[PDB]
Ligand binder design. Sequence first.
Ligand SMILES: Cc1cc2nc3c(=O)[nH]c(=O)nc-3n(C[C@H](O)[C@H](O)[C@H](O)COP(=O)(O)O)c2cc1C
Ligand SMILES: Cc1cc2nc3c(=O)[nH]c(=O)nc-3n(C[C@H](O)[C@H](O)[C@H](O)COP(=O)(O)O)c2cc1C
Ligand SMILES: Cc1cc2nc3c(=O)[nH]c(=O)nc-3n(C[C@H](O)[C@H](O)[C@H](O)COP(=O)(O)O)c2cc1C
Lengths: 357, 338, 356, 342
Amino acid sequence: SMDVFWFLPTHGDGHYLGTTQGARPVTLNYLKQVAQAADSLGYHGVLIPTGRSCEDSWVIASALVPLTERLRYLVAIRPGIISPTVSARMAATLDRLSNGRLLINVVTGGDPDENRGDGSFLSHSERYEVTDEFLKIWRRVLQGEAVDFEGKHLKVQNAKALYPPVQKPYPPLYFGGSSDAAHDLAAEQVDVYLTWGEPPAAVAEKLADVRERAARHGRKVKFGIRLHVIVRETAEEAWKAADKLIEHISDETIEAAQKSFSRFDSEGQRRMAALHDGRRDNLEIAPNLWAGVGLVRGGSGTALVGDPQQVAARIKEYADLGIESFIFSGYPHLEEAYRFAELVFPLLPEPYASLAG
Amino acid sequence: SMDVFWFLPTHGDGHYLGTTQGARPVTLNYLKQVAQAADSLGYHGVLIPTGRSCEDSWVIASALVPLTERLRYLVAIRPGIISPTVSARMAATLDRLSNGRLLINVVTGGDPDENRGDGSFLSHSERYEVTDEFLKIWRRVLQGEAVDFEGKHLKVQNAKALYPPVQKPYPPLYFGGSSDAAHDLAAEQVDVYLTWGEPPAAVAEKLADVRERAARHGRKVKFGIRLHVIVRETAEEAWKAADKLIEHNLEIAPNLWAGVGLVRGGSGTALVGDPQQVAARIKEYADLGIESFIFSGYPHLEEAYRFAELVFPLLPEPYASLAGLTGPFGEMNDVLPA
Amino acid sequence: SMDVFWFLPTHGDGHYLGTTQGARPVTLNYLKQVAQAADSLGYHGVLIPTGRSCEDSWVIASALVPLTERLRYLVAIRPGIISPTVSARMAATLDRLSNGRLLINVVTGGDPDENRGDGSFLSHSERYEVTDEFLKIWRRVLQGEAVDFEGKHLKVQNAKALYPPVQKPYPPLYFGGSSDAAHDLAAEQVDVYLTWGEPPAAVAEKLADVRERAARHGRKVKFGIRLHVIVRETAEEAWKAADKLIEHISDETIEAAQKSFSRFDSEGQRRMAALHDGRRDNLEIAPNLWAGVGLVRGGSGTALVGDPQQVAARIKEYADLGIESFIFSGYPHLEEAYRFAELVFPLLPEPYASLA
Amino acid sequence: SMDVFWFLPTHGDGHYLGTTQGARPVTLNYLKQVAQAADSLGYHGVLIPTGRSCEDSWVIASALVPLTERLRYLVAIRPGIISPTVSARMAATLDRLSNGRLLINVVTGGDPDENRGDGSFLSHSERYEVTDEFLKIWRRVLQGEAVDFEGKHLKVQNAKALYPPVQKPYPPLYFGGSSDAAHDLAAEQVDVYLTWGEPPAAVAEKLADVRERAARHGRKVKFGIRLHVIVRETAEEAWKAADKLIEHNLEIAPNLWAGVGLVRGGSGTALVGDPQQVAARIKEYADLGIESFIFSGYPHLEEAYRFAELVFPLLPEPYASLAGTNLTGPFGEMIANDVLPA
Ligand SMILES: Cc1cc2nc3c(=O)[nH]c(=O)nc-3n(C[C@H](O)[C@H](O)[C@H](O)COP(=O)(O)O)c2cc1C
Ligand SMILES: Cc1cc2nc3c(=O)[nH]c(=O)nc-3n(C[C@H](O)[C@H](O)[C@H](O)COP(=O)(O)O)c2cc1C
Ligand SMILES: Cc1cc2nc3c(=O)[nH]c(=O)nc-3n(C[C@H](O)[C@H](O)[C@H](O)COP(=O)(O)O)c2cc1C
């Protein structure tokens, strides 16, 4: 079993990182282009990021649902900035309009400056306490239960979502995080645990940690990985494109982003930045794993670079560890969605092997 | 100037009130029908209600934006249940995708049971205090400012909306309310004040109160009214349809029927009569300063066509010129209809 | 089995016949409204008329296909005015883009003035000869055959349709006609024979003739009927709306319309106009069968008028004769598509009974 | 004035010519992708080819009209296989539904085997005779006339198009042809004369011939050229992609590469070079009087973005300002979560 996702560039898109040269503005028409591409190419779904640097994920996903037939949408919810009852009604409404194509990404928010801008003045441990109480209300209201809940952070009385969702018991819960509070929350409530593109040894230990905590709660969680991808027909062209992606990234822009990443209260972001740390020589931190994207961009920071056989081999490495979901992205997002689907899909298991023509 | 709105029945639709007979379920397909009808008929926009009995307004409006060309969407925001910065980013994205077709309806929420279900335990005076602080943060972040704000209820530090809206300075703020705190809030921050379909004398006094308070703040507010409509070609058919609507004294004013208010629907009063009678009541409200008219009918799809074909030619421009590409008009295979 | 169709008013729509009062212009937006209504309400398909009085059927059907999911489109082809090879490629493309939702209505054209305007100067017998040779080439090219054909009217050499259709062997062929040449063509080539809304006794004889001729060709054809419908909650409201539909029809327009029909070289049009002769009194030619639409409109001319039980009863009467397809219409087409689907669908067989 | 068109690959698309490697099937979804790409990028329109090797142009164009806002469709009509009255009603209906976005490409058909497959057994001189009579009836019915016409090939009596088009007097007529019979027909009836991508000296001589014949009839025709284009940021990558396109001398003129003519593609020549070289060759053709430019690339979706992002700012208005919608803000991917792209 394997689900291959693509990515909607709600932060912005282009041919190069860091610079405005070759940039592509994010419009309704361009978002339609990427979503309808992933829909017709046969991708399982698309991940839609959230945050201050993005357009709103719920507005984007809701607008693209009537314009696609099979594509699923992994939309992010951020506990602490919205009522859990209201978030559930949004999830129910969007899941009903899409006829069961909604996927939920639980996001706790690792930037204290952005969180204070949204009105949240909570420590790292406190944010996961709100998320813990949030998900308990969210999951229960969506199953038709009039919820009475009074916790340390959230309190609802007769919380009801009158319109039931299509997917039972609720739209699947995806979650990413590397701290101990994140692994506990994932093991207790979520359905799929997501990690960024660390080397296989680091992901295997993170998966083993989550699998252990989930077993202690009598549950089993599925796993997925988030990666960039620069795949070409030959290995020489792929690494040539990787160097070309970052040719306009000055040293003062790398210092500007790293100064902002150190402000983050995120353990998952810390492990991603602990792979590059501003270096430019020796960026291949692992066989066909290139950490050049993390020099400027937040969140995901590594990419699989190589020919179709080299990239498909790295996928089997992660799949052998138990990872079943793969969320890819490329620059630019439209062109690379076709390139991955035409070079890598025939090398992947079904149904992706048979989607090529 | 006049803006004529229609209504999206996101709580549900049907042919009759009270009973489930002839009911029509709210689906994506039917919502497309009503929105695309109001879009092509030439309505200025549609009001989208909010509450526990409705589907989410932001999901529906966002889904209908790429499916319409000119129609505007009056979407409701609710302070107290969402971050003001995040609500502004939501408004910005929907306004950008729609190319300036987003209108904001500020709703405070008058049901204490529903408010407790959403996690808000605030009194009437407190609810308008959050709304006051909410709009100050909401309006300023959308104007490009990095907002630092610490009030009695809300507090943000370095609140920024990185994507600017299409409409400047922000999507217009519509607001409805009858208390003194609402009239003060409307006179200070909002752009359009909304009132229910009261008799013309009662609306004039409410408008005079808001218009007086707005002058003290150096502002002028526009006004709008929300009214159901049962218009037929003759007055006899209209009152026959009104009686049929509630078959499973009510005329509180000339051609103002309060039968819709018997149950918890969109409004509580309705204009019932022939096209000349309905246009006469509209001209009455317009003379008091009302420029926006938010209408609805049962069912909303059929009645959107009925109002637009019987009343639009009797209204000011551009609605007078919307009634009626050339060639044949009506069903022809050689002689054209004349 | 039963397939219920609706109708796209490409001639124009409105609340009243004959006059421009209460008319509704046919735009892309309004056609989207009616097509998307029939799609979501659960109708099997929509019939799209063709002719000089219509917008082009192929442009409209192709434009509405990507805007609907399940609805099928009964598009009309006219042999004699387009190449059979080209017509087949058009059908294949629309059938492929729609993923098998294309239905073909074979139209021969009964107006000699309109036919001469299109460049066809053929007698009634000759028109069915071109249609005969047209359909033979059309059906064979769509089955992957490089066709060589040299007939009295048409001649092709190496006619190929390189893109195969989705429905096999080809999109189903619907056909309407009342002449003897039409019954032969229907019995030999088409898949569904269509008739206008005549009384059940006259329809039963038309169906018996086509099934008799089809047996001599070793084939069996299915049958469908075309009707208007004015259904209300009560029988009094239905007859009140039927009288109201024709209140603005001029007596000069009645003679001017029937004068153009007396010049029509069509038996189906003559059998439909002879049910009224312009006489306005006593229009109910059968229980709940009202022939008021035929006073001005060509083609369909009768309507089922009554309460939901009366309308559903007349439908079952036609179904007992072997009619499986029902193509309904009302004025205006958008509102009345909802009215039929909400008043009559629960009284019909599945899947229409469970769609509400 | 300048109109830049793209191309809908209704015959098929892919990364390479001749081979099936990297091929891309023509589906409704992919045709939407290319059409909606040209729509948002700001192209004037798209050319839709016709023939036995294509899906029907009228079905595709009509299907794409409600899915686009400004993009125009240059749809081909072929006299001899359809009645002129019916063709006009089709043009009127599509022009009305699109609100004046329909363009007509008059195609006579140069393949006798394909013409015989469609039922036409006519010589070269005869084919242009039907086209002459076809356009005369087609143009007159669209202007509201009840047309009576009896020629050597076509005959109509009381031909009327009851629904008038949006563009007056009729959707513009584009036409391509190299024979003397074609140049006479173009100078007399059509609005835009189209030619393939010959070297600039040959195009100037063909355009002057049509302009002389048109002047003798008191008319003036506009001109357009059809070209492939392989434009990259550097000249070395462009020629590398051109060599790779046909791997499974050719530079017949400065930046004019004749590799597309090896197989039955869209045309036979291509502009290959850097953005500065391509815009220079366009300025050379534009100085001759060419106002319409119909470009294409392989694959058509990716290259529609590549030409529009590298060449549009170097072209006259409105294409120079199209590279920058009304939206403002973060132009590019956000650096971290608060640093605007440099
Ligand atoms: C696959 C994936 C997607 C994520 N998407 C987002 C996002 O859209 N917005 C965001 O603020 N954080 C996102 N994150 C980060 C986490 O949700 C969370 O904010 C951060 O990791 C803090 O958790 P931690 O301190 O336990 O590592 C994502 C993480 C992963 C693994
Ligand atoms: C259901 C139905 C639909 C028809 N639709 C058309 C049409 O769209 N255009 C048309 O010219 N004739 C139409 N006709 C009429 C016939 O197809 C035919 O063209 C004409 O009346 C000559 O046939 P006849 O002499 O055998 O009656 C239709 C007939 C039926 C029964
Ligand atoms: C821009 C352009 C586009 C053309 N498109 C087509 C087409 O789609 N199908 C086709 O058969 N011929 C096409 N042609 C060719 C002409 O229609 C015509 O068949 C050919 O020029 C033969 O005429 P000639 O002997 O006068 O040169 C095109 C020509 C040009 C210049």
